[PDB]
Amino acid sequence: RKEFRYRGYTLEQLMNMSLEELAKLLPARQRRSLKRGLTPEQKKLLRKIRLAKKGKYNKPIRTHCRDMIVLPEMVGLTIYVHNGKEFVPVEIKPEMIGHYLGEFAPTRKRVQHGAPGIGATRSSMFVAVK
Amino acid sequence: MAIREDIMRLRRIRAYRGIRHELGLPVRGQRTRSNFRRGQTVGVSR
Amino acid sequence: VIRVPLPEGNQLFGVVEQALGAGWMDVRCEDGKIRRCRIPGKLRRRVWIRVGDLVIVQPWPVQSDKRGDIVYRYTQTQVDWLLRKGKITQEFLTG
RNA sequence: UUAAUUGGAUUCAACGCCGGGAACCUCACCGGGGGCGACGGCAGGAUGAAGGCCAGGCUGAAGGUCUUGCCGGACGCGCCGAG
RNA sequence: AUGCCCCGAAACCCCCGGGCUACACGCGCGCUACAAUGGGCGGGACAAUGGGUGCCGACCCCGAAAGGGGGAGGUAAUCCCCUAAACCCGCCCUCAGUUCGGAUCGCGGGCUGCAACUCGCCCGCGUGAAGCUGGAAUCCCUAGUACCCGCGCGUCAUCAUCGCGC
RNA sequence: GCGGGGUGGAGCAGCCUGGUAGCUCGUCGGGCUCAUAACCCGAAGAUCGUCGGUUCAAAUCCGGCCCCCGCUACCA
Ligand SMILES: [Mg+2]
Ligand SMILES: [Mg+2]
Ligand SMILES: [Mg+2]
Ligand SMILES: [Mg+2]
Ligand SMILES: [Mg+2]
């Protein structure tokens, strides 16, 4: 219980596995996305992760495609996302494969509440507007 | 226990479906301007 | 950023104590001398001023003692907003 | 509360109302990137303006710019008024 | 459609990602219940308005279910949507927070889409919250009308607790 | 002489005749109204100064005590 096993297959046991034999080990949504092909932008992004995986492209990977499905290629490195105004780092670990990329870059600031004002109740609605 | 560890697993990686489990809020995309009032009333003046 | 009635020109900050009557407002500013604000006629219609409302006024170079004149008010979304910037210290309102 | 949580309507006669069940568009809102001056005159222009591309950087992605040099064959927001 | 005043390399025109779906809280209109004037399981009965060529799909075959692979006939009183539900008979439950009530959550399978995390809809197993008839107040209805039960168009690539009709 | 008040933000009930801590001005919410005051309704708020006895069982019977006290004056 220190190694990670997804469906009985270790990381480097599945790291060399294919992409059509892979999808039988993912839930519906990701199996279907892997079956209607990848979008053009995600092609352009995989063709920048693989270079950054061999020896080249030692430069921060950025993106707008929050839809990309994490895969056994991306385990280990640290890529960015775009949560609306800025690029936020997501250090990819195992136990993320299957989830969505944008799933880890939240998008609305947590809310903390002040105090009710003029109109929050029927006792301060017409007693203010004269 | 199995459900609990399936929740902790989402708490680790800091997903979006794990933080809602943290703060005790809806999880499956509901709206909350109007329902889910598990708190206590607030006053202004009288 | 934000458009707030800062001191522009020679403006003053009016935080009133009592309305003696007929529009006279004794104001308690950080300056010290008892100033007595009065009101123009453009706002006497649509707005509603009382005590505790920190607002902006304008003083007059005559005797610099009992002066002030409303030109614009403050809404509850600004009166305490103006604390974090420290543009005004609220302890000129509790002593 | 927020980077933005776009606006109009407040008794009858405002609140499943604007045919408003908004993933993109609709979109008017916050972050970023790029294009647009019929027409009269000005610096300039066949010793070649406006204007376009294989490949590579910057970039979220882009001949959008720059590196690189190829092409096209008359006009000209680099300047003023107008539209 | 339109007068006046501001923008005029921008407040004009396109493209990618976010928001309108944020949540201590007050309110308007509705849907499901608090059970016997009922819940479940197996059988038996009877409609009307409307719509279809970017579309409606009979019939056959795979699947437990959502759905999938083929595919006649239809530019319409011809073919299709389209053997409705409340109702009846037979057996289990017997007044209990229950065989009432199904919110909230975990895992797995699918459809539309250029794209389902923020934020779509549908299926199977599991967990099983408040709720035991509602204070002062207030609304709609005079006959095939009120109440009770289902259906069709609109919006629509998918999604109806809504609007307008039966 | 020594004894009393010991309790919601408060004001006092409320004993002996023991089992709702009780009514009123206040506090926040909702009604009524074109809107405000008055009027109707709902919840929140001390849980009896405290140990101890009685008591099946206590503001409710009382004592011990902690606090506030309290009706009262040089006594040649
Ligand atoms: Mg949009
Ligand atoms: Mg809205
Ligand atoms: Mg049931
Ligand atoms: Mg989704
Ligand atoms: Mg009133």
Side-chain angles (χ1 to χ4, degrees), chain B residues 7-45:
Chain B
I7 295 164
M8 303 313 295
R9 189 181 301 113
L10 306 178
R11 286 195 54 126
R12 276 195 279 277
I13 75 188
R14 312 291 296 169
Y16 169 92
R17 222 171 86 217
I19 315 178
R20 316 289 284 177
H21 261 153
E22 291 195 0
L23 321 164
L25 311 172
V27 184
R28 310 200 169 180
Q30 286 104 6
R31 288 197 175 180
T32 41
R33 186 152 171 195
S34 299
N35 297 335
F36 310 94
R37 294 186 188 271
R38 288 305 180 183
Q40 195 65 6
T41 173
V42 169
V44 177
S45 42

Side-chain angles (χ1 to χ4, degrees), chain A residues 117-118 127-128, chain C residues 45 47-48 76:
Chain A
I118 305 160
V127 191
Chain C
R45 55 182 184 92
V47 306
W48 179 49
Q76 204 166 256

